């Protein structure tokens, strides 16, 4: 129902959502305050009572609704059953590009990369 | 069917009647982003539909 | 890239030998070109 | 026994400075009570039951403080 | 009888420092009242029932404080 | 006397510390008044017809406080 | 005698200024408690405890402070 | 009579603590004025018309406080 | 020593104002503790261990302050 | 020797009022830099209002240091 | 002779007010430490190596302050 | 008495530094929070952490002056 | 007799100024950890302004402990 990538849409009833917001992590719950926040490039998780399932993400927007439905939208995304050397060899080329408008884009890679290392 | 759809910008987003209901922290350019990303997203949907 | 695209570099640094079977390898290759237009006549060509 | 009466009156006046704490104290709880309800939804119930419970526990400062001043005037 | 009268006057002046608390106290409630209504919509009704119920309970500091100073006069 | 006159003078000086509260008190209400109006729309409306009410009730501190010093 | 009784009464009044700290202290915990729950829903358990646990540890100031005043009152 | 003069001088020094309230008081209104203007829509409209109205009402603390010190 | 006993009692009362700092101090730490957990998920782990480490270091003010008053007793 | 003695304590008690002006300046300048962390109005608009705020808050200190120097 | 003993005791009590500053001081650093970690990523290392460094530099107020009280006691 | 109240007067003067001490902290706290927003450490804001600091330690210099005046 | 007595009260009254420096340090270090919960300048920018802020705020305490130790 409400948690979509443009190519692949994911989730539907929820007991606890954890998100990596604009200003630090947050947790929506059974009744929560209606809010919009930019979603920073980091991990996320769903809940169904006592069910642990964590995804990574690119970033985007979250929107807690008055009608109580939470909508989470990102671009790309299983946890470690998805993303080491794939990361490593890329991290090399990343840092290299930074020393180069063009190298500014690589700045974006360092933070996004460094984050993923922690998983 | 030839169709149209509205994109709204930063000012329109702040000024919207029920924007008050949403406890969006005015913590730096927040409606701006929502626009900049509703322009890409809306555009996509149109293109997907247009192509298909 | 942008913010508009922020999460398309965070999704394309985070793109780069698994899921990339068609799907993602192709989500990464875009073949678009822009050209600005002036007084009929154009400006010049460039990759998106 | 004039000093015991004299220092009793300064003592009662000095006791009143503690109400500075209870006075601001009540304000702080009610302020956050109206700010939290500007974000809703649980007006009466949830947030209102605690705000009176918070007021009671903060005016318990004032009643234990006015007691010491009234003790020293009686 | 010169000391009981003297210490009564300092005692009344010392009692006035408690109004520092009630003075700031009122401000705090009213400040949050206008800030909350800059978010809207429930001003008159819902919020105003508490906005001044909070003023009453915070000026009850001042009236119990002015009483001790006026008692020492 | 000369103690009742002396202690009346310190007593009058001591009563002036209560103005610390009303001085900060006004500022707080006016501060939140301008910050709430940086957010609109009701300027000379709802907000301002309460900020003066807040000022009055916070300078009622100072009037009851300057009374005890001028009394002494 | 006399001076020991006199300074005993000022001493008891001076002790009451410490409740300024505990009075504001309670407020602060309860204010953040209602603000945190304006984001829900850990109403009972999680928040309510830490609050009452925070209230207890902040009124432990007041009970150790009212003790010194009541010690000098009796 | 040496004590009415003595306690007149401590009484005038004690009166100066009340300026602690007006000194912070002005700062509070002015800080909120510049933070609200970091957001606009205008400085020349609505904000400043009260950002010194607030200053006046908060330095009215200091004038009533410096009066009691200069009186003693 | 009439005065040594008298100034001992005012000295013990004057020592009690330091608890104003420890009383407010505890509140500040616990307030930020509940606010941070209103954002989650670090209820157990991470935060609570700093919540009573911060409380201990702030009530160490009170125990070193109550000691000076009880010493003058 | 009492009017001279109480003159010196009276001059020291007057110095506590600077606590207010000392914190006061900080508040206006702190808000000045935080507001300019949002821009774009450093030269004109904002910096005018921040010396004006400083002046009116150190006017506390000048009226307070005068009563201490008076005594 | 005797007044030097009396004013020593009040002098020791008046020295305890400085602990109001360090008591609140600790709380401030620890409160910000738990709010910053309700945000991350800087839990162990980066933030904590400065956090108890902030505690030490703010309890150095209390040790220099309890020193003057214990000096007069 | 003139030497005695000179020493109490010199100790009472020191409470004014409570204002300057917190004062510096406030400016520097806002300087580091504003620069957590960037990009202007070198130029703009940090240069003024010395203009704000100087005007706030001018409190302490005029304050320590009255205490050292009542020392010599 | 009195010069020694008021020297001891004067040394105790000097200690209240540390209330300012004690809170002062906290404020700077608090904003230092909050600003770094946002990054990326943990080493350089962040701490060079912070430790410089601590020094300027403990300079209150050193000029304050000096007046107490001078009177003791």
Which CATH number covers residue M33?
1.20.20.10
Burial of residue K16 (CB within 10 Å: 0-12, 13-18, 19+) is: buried
3-state class (DSSP) for residue C47:
strand
Query: Looking at chain K from residue 25 to 44, which residues have their Cβ under 8 Å from any Cβ of chain M?
Result: 25-29, 31-33, 35-37, 39-40, 42
Cβ distance E31 to F26 less than 8 Å, yes or no, reads no
**Opening angle at CA H44, ends H40 and H50, nearest 5:** 90
CA angle D29, D31, D37 (to 5 degrees): 100
Check: CB of residue L30 under 8 Å from CB of residue M28.
no
Q: What is the DSSP letter of H41?
A: S
Cβ proximity of M71 and M15 under 8 Å: no
H/E run at residue C33: strand C33-35
A27 forms beta bridges with: A18
| Whether B and C touch (3+ CB pairs < 8 Å), yes or no | yes
Residues in contact with F24: Cβ distance below 8 Å, sequence separation at least 6, in sequence order: E23, E24, E27, H21, H24, H25, H28
List CB contacts (< 8 A) between D21 and chain E: 21
Helix (H, G, I), strand (E, B) or coil at F1: coil
Alpha helices in F3-72 (DSSP H): 3-14, 19-37, 48-71
- Non-local (6+) Cβ contacts of K22 within 8 A are I21, I61, K58, K59, K61, K62, K65, M18, M22
What phi and psi values does residue L50 have, to the nearest 5 degrees? -105, -25
Resolution of the structure, angstroms? 3.0
The single residue listed with the structure tokens 């009340």 is H18
Please, what is the end-to-end C-alpha distance for chain I in angstroms?
A: 15
What are the backbone angles phi and psi of residue M8, rounded to the nearest 5°? -85, -40
Q: How was this structure determined?
A: X-ray
CATH topology assigned to domain A1-83: ATP Synthase; domain 1 (2.60.15)
Q: How far apart are CA G62 and CA G59, in angstroms?
A: 5
Output b/e per residue, I26-45; b: 16+ Cβ within 10 A.
Answer: bbbbbbbbbbbbbbbbbbee
Whether E13 and F48 have beta carbons less than 8 Å apart is answered as no
Helix, strand, coil percent values for chain D (each to nearest 5): 90, 0, 10
Q: Would the CB atoms of G53 and I66 count as touching at under 8 Å? A: no
Closest CA to G50 of G69, G37, G39: G37
Cα separation, H30 vs J24, whole angstroms: 10
Q: Which two tokens stand for residue J43?
A: 């030269």
The total number of structural domains that make up chain H: 1
How many CB atoms within 10 Å of residue E10? Answer: 24
State the Cα–Cα distance between residues H11 and C31, nearest whole angstrom: 84
Side-chain half-sphere CA neighbours of F67 within 13 A: 14
**Over chain A, what HEC string results?**
CCCECCCCECCCCCCEEEEECCCCEEEEECCCCCCEEEECCCCEEECCCCCCEEECCCCEEEEECCCCCEEEEECCCCCCCCCCHHHHHHHHHHHHHHCCCCCHHHHHHHHHHHHHHCC
Domain coordinates in residue numbering, chain A: 1-83, 84-119
**Contact (Cβ atoms closer than 8 angstroms) between residue J19 and residue L63:** no
Between chain B and chain C, how many beta carbons pairs sit less than 8 Å apart?
Answer: 10
Distance in angstroms (rounded) separating the CA atoms of residues H62 and H69: 10
Interatomic CA distance for residues D29 and E58, integer angstroms: 11
Report yes or no: F18 and D19 within 8 Å, Cβ to Cβ.
Answer: no
Q: Which domain holds residue H21?
A: 1-72
d(CA F63, CA F69): 10
Q: How far apart are CA A44 and CA A17, in angstroms?
A: 8
Which of I18, I23, I16, I15 is closest to I55 using CA atoms?
Answer: I23
Q: What three-state secondary structure class fits C34?
A: strand
The DSSP letter of residue E41 is S
Whether G34 and D29 lie within 8 Å, measured CB to CB: yes
Q: K26 CB contacts (<8 Å, ≥6 apart)?
A: I25, I54, I57, I58, I61, K55, K58, K59, M26
Burial status of residue B8 (CB atoms within 10 A of its CB: 0-12, 13-18, 19 or more): middle
Which 51-70 residues of chain J touch chain H by CB within 8 A?
52-53, 56-57, 59-61, 63-64, 67-68
Burial class (CB within 10 angstroms; exposed 0-12, middle 13-18, buried 19+) of K3: middle
C1-48 in CATH: which number? Answer: 1.10.1620.20
Q: Which two tokens stand for residue F23?
A: 């001085």
Q: Which distant-in-sequence residues (6+ apart) come within 8 Å of J70 by Cβ?
A: none
Distance (Å) of CA K32 to CA A33, I44, M25:
24, 18, 13
Please give the Cα distance from K54 to D28 (Å, whole number).
Answer: 28
Contact at CB, F36 and E33, closer than 8 angstroms: no
| Cα(D68)–Cα(I16) distance, integer angstroms | 15
Give the pair of three-digit tokens for residue H72. 């003693």
Tokens of I52: 């009573």
CA distances from E32 to E61, F37, M8 (A): 19, 13, 46
Helices (DSSP H) in M1-72: which residue ranges? 2-13, 18-36, 47-70
Nearest C-alpha of chain E: how many angstroms from B19?
Answer: 10
Compute the distance between CA of residue C10 and CA of residue A42 in angstroms, rounded to an integer. Answer: 10
CB atoms within 10 A of CB C42: 9
Q: Counting beta carbons within 10 angstroms of the beta carbon of residue G17, is it exposed (0 to 12), middle (13 to 18) or buried (19 or more)?
A: buried
* Cα(F18)–Cα(H61) distance, integer angstroms: 10
- For the record, the structure tokens of E27 come out as 């401000």
Cα–Cα distance, E67 to E56 (Å, whole number): 16
Could you tell me how far CA F35 lies from the centroid of its own chain?
20
Provide, as residue numbers in chain L, all residues whose Cβ is less than 8 Å from the Cβ of M57: 21, 24-25, 28
Residue M28 in contact with residue M54, Cβ under 8 Å? yes
State phi, psi for G73 to the nearest 5 degrees: -100, -20
Q: Which of M6, M33, M58 lies at the smallest CB-CB distance from K7?
A: M6
| In contact, I26 and K27? CB cutoff 8 Å | yes
């Amino acid at each position: 129902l409400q948690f979509a990538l443009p190519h692949e849409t994911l989730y539907s009833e929820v007991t606890q959502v954890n998100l990596p917001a604009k200003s630090g992590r947050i947790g929506v719950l059974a009744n929560h305050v209606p809010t919009v926040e930019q979603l920073l490039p980091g991990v996320v998780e769903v809940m169904e009572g006592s069910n642990s399932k964590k995804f990574f993400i690119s970033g985007g927007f979250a929107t807690v609704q008055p009608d109580s439905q939470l909508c989470v939208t990102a671009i790309e995304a299983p946890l470690e059953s998805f993303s080491e050397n794939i990361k490593n060899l890329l991290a090399e080329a990343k840092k290299n590009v930074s020393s180069s408008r063009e190298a500014a884009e690589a700045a974006i890679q360092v933070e996004v990369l460094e984050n993923l290392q922690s998983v | 069917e030839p169709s149209e759809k509205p994109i709204f910008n930063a000012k329109t987003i702040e000024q919207s009647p029920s924007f008050g209901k949403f406890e969006i922290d005015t913590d730096a350019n927040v409606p701006r982003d929502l626009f900049e990303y509703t322009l890409a997203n809306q555009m996509l949907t149109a293109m997907a539909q247009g192509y298909a | 890239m942008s913010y508009a695209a922020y999460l398309n570099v965070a999704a394309q640094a985070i793109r780069s030998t698994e899921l990339q079977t068609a799907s993602v390898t192709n989500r990464s290759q875009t073949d678009a070109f822009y050209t600005q237009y002036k007084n009929a006549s154009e400006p010049t060509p460039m990759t998106k | 026994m004039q000093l015991v009466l004299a220092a009793k009156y300064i003592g009662a006046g000095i006791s009143t400075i503690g109400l500075l704490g209870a006075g601001i104290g009540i304000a702080i709880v009610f302020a956050a009570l109206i700010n939290g309800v500007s974000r809703n939804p649980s007006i009466k119930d949830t947030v209102f039951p605690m705000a009176i419970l918070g007021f009671a526990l903060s005016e318990a400062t004032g009643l234990f403080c006015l007691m010491v001043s009234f003790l020293l005037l009686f």
